[PDB]
Amino acid sequence: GPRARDLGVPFEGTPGALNAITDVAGVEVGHTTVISGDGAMVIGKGPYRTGVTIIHPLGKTSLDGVAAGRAVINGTGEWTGMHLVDEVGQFLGPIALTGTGNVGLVHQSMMDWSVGKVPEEALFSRLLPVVAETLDNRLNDVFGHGLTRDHVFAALDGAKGGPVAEGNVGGGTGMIAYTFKGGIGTSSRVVSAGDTRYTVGVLVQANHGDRNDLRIAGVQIGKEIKGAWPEVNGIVKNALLIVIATDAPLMPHQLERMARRAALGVGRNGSTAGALSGEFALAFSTSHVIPLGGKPRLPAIINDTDSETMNALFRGVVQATEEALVNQLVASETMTGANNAKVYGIPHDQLARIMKARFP
Amino acid sequence: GPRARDLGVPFEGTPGALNAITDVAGVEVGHTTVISGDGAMVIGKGPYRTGVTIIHPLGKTSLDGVAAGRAVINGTGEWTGMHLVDEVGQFLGPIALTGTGNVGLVHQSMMDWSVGKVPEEALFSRLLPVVAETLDNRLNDVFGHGLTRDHVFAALDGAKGGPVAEGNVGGGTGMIAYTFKGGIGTSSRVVSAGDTRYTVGVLVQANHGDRNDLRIAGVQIGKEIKGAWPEVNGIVAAKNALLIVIATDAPLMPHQLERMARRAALGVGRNGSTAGALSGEFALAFSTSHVIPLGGKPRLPAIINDTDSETMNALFRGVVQATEEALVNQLVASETMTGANNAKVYGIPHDQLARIMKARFP
Amino acid sequence: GPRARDLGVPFEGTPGALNAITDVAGVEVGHTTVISGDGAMVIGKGPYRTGVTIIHPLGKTSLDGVAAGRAVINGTGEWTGMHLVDEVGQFLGPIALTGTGNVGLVHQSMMDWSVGKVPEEALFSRLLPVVAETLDNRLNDVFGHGLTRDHVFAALDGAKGGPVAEGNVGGGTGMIAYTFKGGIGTSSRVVSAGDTRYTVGVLVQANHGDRNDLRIAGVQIGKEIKGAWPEVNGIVKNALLIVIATDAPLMPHQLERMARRAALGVGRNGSTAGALSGEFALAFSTSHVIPLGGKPRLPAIINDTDSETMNALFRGVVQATEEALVNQLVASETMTGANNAKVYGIPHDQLARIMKARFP
Amino acid sequence: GPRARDLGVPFEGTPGALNAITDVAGVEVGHTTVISGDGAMVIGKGPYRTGVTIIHPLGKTSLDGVAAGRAVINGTGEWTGMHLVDEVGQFLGPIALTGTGNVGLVHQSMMDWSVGKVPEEALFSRLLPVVAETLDNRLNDVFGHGLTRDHVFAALDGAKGGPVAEGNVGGGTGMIAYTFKGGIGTSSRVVSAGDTRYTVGVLVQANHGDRNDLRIAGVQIGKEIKGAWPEVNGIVAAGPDAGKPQDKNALLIVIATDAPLMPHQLERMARRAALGVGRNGSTAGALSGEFALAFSTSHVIPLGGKPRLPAIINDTDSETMNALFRGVVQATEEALVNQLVASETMTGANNAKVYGIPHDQLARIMKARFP
């Protein structure tokens, strides 16, 4: 299936080989996608359109922390482990992105997983799991306990590097973005900072925005698309989570700066951060790592005022965020869920047509 | 039993009638205390010394929000719902204080609790439960699922106004503070705010500090207390946190409540601790008069100027004093406990405490 | 003179009558523009291309505070009085926007201005002047004391409602934005919340961005424009200050939210916030006013979860910011300054031709 | 003159040799103290009781930045260069502490000083002077231009290592703390983490707090001290107006350490200052601008070069961090008391008189409490 560039959408910058967050070496991504039931929703009975996406910054067997920093665009949502990130500039264990109704279950499941996977002496370090959410309330039985501990273990255990599945998968399964089908998107940039190449990888769980605000490559596209409006039975709280990985050896305060750039990439695509739209970004470094109870490893150190290096990284965040958002839309297929609510994937043919008209 | 004042510990300011957070009208507190098993710990089998404490800002039947603001002393811990507080200056639903291992269970149970009670069209507002933790790792089987959904429902449904149980109860059950038994403490102040009085109520879940730093009424007391050192199976032995909840009936805006929360640190400072590297120390303040009807117009009965020192300083002083006293009240309320692996932590000795206070304050 | 709309640039939303920050009733703006000297720069002798811009939130005679909140995109710059805003949610007195070298002079001049102007009993309230800066280092003798107390007094006293002069004036005099001439820009939006209308006014002092990132109405325009690159002798640190005024009766924490929306408007126009780019936003309400030592006046109260109202206001900030930035570019004319550095105003004829091609 | 310890005030921890911020090697401190005029205040004519205190983190000739992080207890006040610190975790140039009325003058004067001392090609780095204030409004003609550029230059140029003058000097000259004479105080702690020793030095400009809240060594001492209330024209300030605690207070805390800390770790250091302040009883008034800035002298960033981080500390290394944190709390606590002891009775503008906390009484109280 084509991704955004393939359909003729131009973006600046050079992607990594996978054009995904896994272009940052050692990052692993796993999804569990829960799709079951059809028709009228009854709380506790589905239909279910939900899941969880796991990102292991250093791979699933790592006990070490990664340097990290975050930013908030609009904080009407949940992302656990963030007080820790703010305070000590690192987090341990994986990042879970899921649906709002699943947060508690995923949080406890991550602890349980640690008990069976992590040495008991290290369990102490597994007590502040990182779990974030967007709300799949149109397509999913949010309160209905559709996600199980086993689903979470499967995502934790199944995570891998290499190409990342996008669209209606994992935490993104039941999401809606720009009034089209929401979901998971990812992109990366390889940036040149003088004599060194660094990678910036971004994965988004997109559940935000309005059709009439959407811009793709600067084109206000909602009015240009014909049909594809959501339906109920056949008749015609937002959020966005942004995860940024880099192999640049950044300190925590520098990673906050990286996270703060995501908003500019979001800005490019037209949304204005709704009052109840939980829009968050978290950035981590895979080269600035903190062995559990050990000496932090900082291979090289970058000056914040080194604009050559920092600007290349910041530009990478903005570009990869912009593209990750479009990649999501293009990856996400039309879906009918709870109460026969139907949300369309942004139509490829119309998008390709629009890009040709605008960028011969 | 005696609280700190009853042992002759002096504090400044005028407490409310209950000297508890429930002196703020309409606030309800519930505990579920889970104490079971003895001897060697096996994960999933206890012993359990844990629980959950529930605070309903406007009572358990309220669907409305309260204006709120928070502060971090040291952020190595979890407190959910706080991004919401930072952003829109309010939170819906109860505050849950619990042990670290219980956070996810309590979070999901709070959502479940709303289901069937709250109108389906209002369920959306129940999706960001406020849950905070400290770690009961020495006395409790943290990962062992000792806390059940039913325990959480019981605290949510059982909460009430009036006197608040302190000590080894609810979320404070298995906690350790200043190397003595930790737990729940509470206090209040009625403050004279210019031409009006307001109540500031504070509840703490204390799992922080070192005996050698502890000051009570300014007295460095660790060295004055004889014995009472923690034991491992009856032999003297060779991650902390502190949660502070501030309620006030002052009609404060969210940014003003952040200021209130930031005062908690000064009260903590009076008692001598220095906020350890891994010590998750947080404060959350809410107003019970600045309320936000679900999907309606905020109700702000009166408005206060941040530069009104007469009014703000009285409230700020209230936070400091009530925090300071709530911490000492916790110590006094918490009794010696033996828990997992026969780990034993002593309640600060009342007889010794009284003797010291009498000696220092004739 | 033509503004961006007059050149055929499309924008969304409805501007107020003046399409300026002064569409918010009672707000006054004054500029002092200091242009003297030519040729080689010698510190203390010019040439000078600098100035100061004053914004009186409630007019120059007011001793009252306005509810306020700020946001930081990238904090490598100065903006005084902001600790006060963060703490008590208000500031007293005018906003001054100026060149980096003038901050201290402007700061003390604002205090001086209050002396005699303000009853001695109220002088306490004048001790935390709000002064912000961008760096006019290429066109101006920054350290050369080109701005005088008299210049500052003139701006304070000469400030007025009505049309706001844009371009190479006041604090924007010697600025450079997107590798074109920088300066002052302004725009406004009248926003609808049910039946209630509010105005959101924005004024920018723009000294940020690269030509190759610039996007006007989504068009990446730097590559489409021919010539107009900066020169020195005829041979071919940034910042952006955003001031947001609204007559919505917002509380301070809500105004922080408004300020955080500015970054999204900046994002639309393509920049990525350089490592040394001081990019800040300050938002204030002219209806939520705090009489000195009195009761705050809050005529109405808005629920943060009132999407209808808040989103209208948010959309307004984003739109007015986007347009203020383009208005700045269009209003700023080519200038030669210190060391014969020459910076071109973005070419009107080319911009119009490009906009006509893109938006028939 | 005696400092707090010499009056029998006990403190925990081990001070550096100087028990001052200059126990952190290379830190230099300079004061310019402006005291002139007596009697009725006329704006523009004095009397003046003001000044400026300069702290050069790496010495007056350094062009390099220090890693830094800040904390706000109550933000009703000014401290410039702090957006820079929050964003990039360092600041260049000196810290200046002064009276509120002098902020702009000092800010511009520091730039002017740079023009003199700094290579033209490095001037770009001197654009965000760090200037902080407390308000000397009871003893000083705040708006009256008492401070001159020459005063600032003298503090900048005169700054040095070694013993740091405390009390009514530099920025502290006209200040009032706990209803006694305010001013400059300093202390340090040498802390142990394994075989590693670090120094934490603290300097404060104190203009905060009320006598009724003051605790020294945990003793609530305001009621134990007899007399020494502030006076105006020869009588004790009393009545529904003149008899209430001062507002428009402030406290500036500067923390230096030679521990190689990253900026976010220095923010944590700065947040510890509040606990030290708390020990001494104050509750941060609504208009009390109370701020802390912490910097490292070992984690330095040469201008345009690579940051130098000679060692690295894990935030979760409780042994190391807790020693440093405890160091900040203790040094802050002691600096505040050292300030009170160093500041002598002063009469200033409008014949306002503020007493230094009485040494004889303090010593007697301490001797009774700690026999």
Task: Determine, for residues B84 and A76 on separate chains, whether the beta-carbon distance falls below 8 Å.
Answer: yes
What is the total residue count of chain D? 371
DSSP code of residue B341: T
Chain D, residues 73-92, CB within 8 A of chain C, namely 74-84, 86-88
Within 8 A of B254 by CB-CB distance, chain C residues are 251, 253
Residue carrying the six token digits 């032995």: B237
Instruction: Check if the beta carbon of residue C125 is closer than 8 Å to that of residue C102.
Output: no
Instruction: Check if the beta carbon of residue C139 is closer than 8 Å to that of residue C77.
Output: no
Instruction: Check if the beta carbon of residue D143 is closer than 8 Å to that of residue D318.
Output: no
Largest alpha-carbon pair distance within chain B?
62
Sign, Cα dihedral of B306, B310, B311, B316: positive
The span from the first CA to the last CA of chain A, in angstroms, equals 23
Which of C253, C294, C296 lies nearest to residue B89, judging by beta carbons?
C253
SS3 for D54-94 is: EEECCCCCCCCEEEEEEEEEECCCCECCHHHHHHHCEEECC
Report how many Cβ contacts below 8 Å link chain B to chain D.
98
Q: How far is B158 from chain C (nearest CA, A)?
A: 30
Which of D305, D309, D315 lies nearest to residue A88, judging by beta carbons?
D315
Residue carrying the six token digits 């050692």: A26
Domain that holds residue C152: 1-360
Q: What are the two backbone dihedrals, phi and then psi, of residue A326, each rounded to the nearest 5 degrees? A: -75, -40
Task: Determine, for residues D286 and B219 on separate chains, whether the beta-carbon distance falls below 8 Å.
Answer: no
Q: How far is CA C260 from the centre of its chain?
A: 15
In terms of Cβ atoms closer than 10 Å to its own Cβ (0-12, 13-18, 19+), residue A12 is: middle
Give CA angle at B36 (B30, B37), nearest 5°.
165
Residue B104 touches chain D, beta carbons under 8 Å: no
Comparing CA positions, the residue from D53, D272, D295 lying closest to residue D175 is D53
Spatial separation of the C-alpha atoms in residues D125 and D101, rounded to whole Å: 25
Q: How far is C272 from chain A (nearest CA, A)?
A: 6
Show which subunits contact D, needing at least 3 CB pairs below 8 angstroms: A, B, C
Spatial separation of the C-alpha atoms in residues D142 and D42, rounded to whole Å: 10
Half-sphere exposure for B106 (CA within 13 Å, toward CB): 35
DSSP code of residue A40: S
Q: How far is D264 from chain A (nearest CA, A)?
A: 6
Half-sphere exposure for D20 (CA within 13 Å, toward CB): 21
Instruction: Check if the beta carbon of residue D305 is closer than 8 Å to that of residue A303.
Output: yes
Q: Who's near B289: CB < 8 A, 6+ residues apart?
A: B249, B250, B251, B299, B300, B301, B302
Indicate the Cα dihedral angle C85, C91, C94, C98, nearest 10°: -20
Helix-, strand-, coil-residue percentages of chain D, each rounded to 5? 30, 30, 40
Cα–Cα distance list, D143 to B44, D108, D205 (Å): 69, 17, 20
Sign, Cα dihedral of D243, D245, D247, D252: positive
Task: Please tell me whether residue B221 adopts helix, strand or coil conformation.
Answer: coil
Which of C88, C252, C298 lies nearest to residue B307, judging by beta carbons?
C88
Q: Who's near C195: CB < 8 A, 6+ residues apart?
A: none
Which residue type is seen at D268? R
Exposure class string for D45-65: b at 16+ Cβ within 10 A, else e: ebbbbbbbbbbbbbbbebbbb
Task: Determine, for residues B90 and C298 on separate chains, whether the beta-carbon distance falls below 8 Å.
Answer: no
Comparing CA positions, the residue from B274, B304, B299, B278 lying closest to residue B288 is B299
Give CA angle at B310 (B306, B312), nearest 5°.
40
Q: How far is B303 from chain C (nearest CA, A)?
A: 7
Spatial separation of the C-alpha atoms in residues C138 and C140, rounded to whole Å: 6
Name residue B223's beta-bridge partners.
Answer: none
Spatial separation of the C-alpha atoms in residues C199 and C188, rounded to whole Å: 7
Spatial separation of the C-alpha atoms in residues B319 and B285, rounded to whole Å: 10
Q: How far is CA D50 from the centre of its chain?
A: 14
Instruction: Check if the beta carbon of residue C335 is closer than 8 Å to that of residue C343.
Output: yes
Instruction: Check if the beta carbon of residue D175 is closer than 8 Å to that of residue D346.
Output: no
Give CA angle at D218 (D215, D222), nearest 5°.
30
Q: Who's near B164: CB < 8 A, 6+ residues apart?
A: B18, B20, B21, B22, B29, B184, B186, B203
Which of A74, A272, A310 lies nearest to residue C275, judging by beta carbons?
A310
Spatial separation of the C-alpha atoms in residues A54 and A106, rounded to whole Å: 10
In terms of Cβ atoms closer than 10 Å to its own Cβ (0-12, 13-18, 19+), residue B105 is: buried
Comparing CA positions, the residue from A251, A358, A241, A345 lying closest to residue A302 is A251
Task: Determine, for residues B292 and C303 on separate chains, whether the beta-carbon distance falls below 8 Å.
Answer: yes
| Cβ atoms < 10 Å from Cβ of C235 | 8
Taking each helix axis from N to C end, the angle separating C103-117 and D103-117, rounded to the nearest 10 degrees, works out to: 150
The domain that holds A77 is classified in CATH as 3.60.70.12
Largest alpha-carbon pair distance within chain C?
61
| Cβ atoms < 10 Å from Cβ of C157 | 13
**Experimental determination approach used:** X-ray
Spatial separation of the C-alpha atoms in residues C342 and B329, rounded to whole Å: 71
DSSP A48-90: EEEEEEEEETT-TT---EEEEEEEEEE--S-BTTHHHHHHHSE
Which of A290, A295, A301 lies nearest to residue D307, judging by beta carbons?
A301
Closest Cα in chain B to D370: B360
Q: How far is CA B285 from the centre of its chain?
A: 11
Closest Cα in chain B to C66: B305
Residue D319 touches chain A, beta carbons under 8 Å: no
C58's tokens: 């409630």
Give CA angle at C85 (C301, C152), nearest 5°.
115
Spatial separation of the C-alpha atoms in residues A243 and A245, rounded to whole Å: 7
Instruction: Check if the beta carbon of residue D299 is closer than 8 Å to that of residue D261.
Output: yes
Instruction: Check if the beta carbon of residue C113 is closer than 8 Å to that of residue C151.
Output: no
Comparing CA positions, the residue from B139, B217, B178, B172 lying closest to residue B53 is B172
Instruction: Check if the beta carbon of residue A224 is closer than 8 Å to that of residue A331.
Output: no
What is the total residue count of chain A? 360
B211's tokens: 């005996």
Q: How far is B76 from chain A (nearest CA, A)?
A: 5
| Cβ atoms < 10 Å from Cβ of D352 | 22
Looking at A184-287, list the stretches that DSSP marks H as alpha helix, in order from N- to C-terminal side: 252-268
Instruction: Check if the beta carbon of residue C162 is closer than 8 Å to that of residue C152.
Output: no
Taking each helix axis from N to C end, the angle separating D263-279 and A252-268, rounded to the nearest 10 degrees, works out to: 110
D368's tokens: 């009774």
Instruction: Check if the beta carbon of residue B80 is closer than 8 Å to that of residue B88.
Output: no
Task: Please tell me whether residue A333 adopts helix, strand or coil conformation.
Answer: coil
In total, how many domains does chain D have?
1
Helix-, strand-, coil-residue percentages of chain B, each rounded to 5? 30, 30, 40
Within 8 A of C312 by CB-CB distance, chain A residues are none
Report how many Cβ contacts below 8 Å link chain B to chain C.
54
Which of D278, D281, D287 lies nearest to residue B307, judging by beta carbons?
D287
Residue A138 touches chain C, beta carbons under 8 Å: no
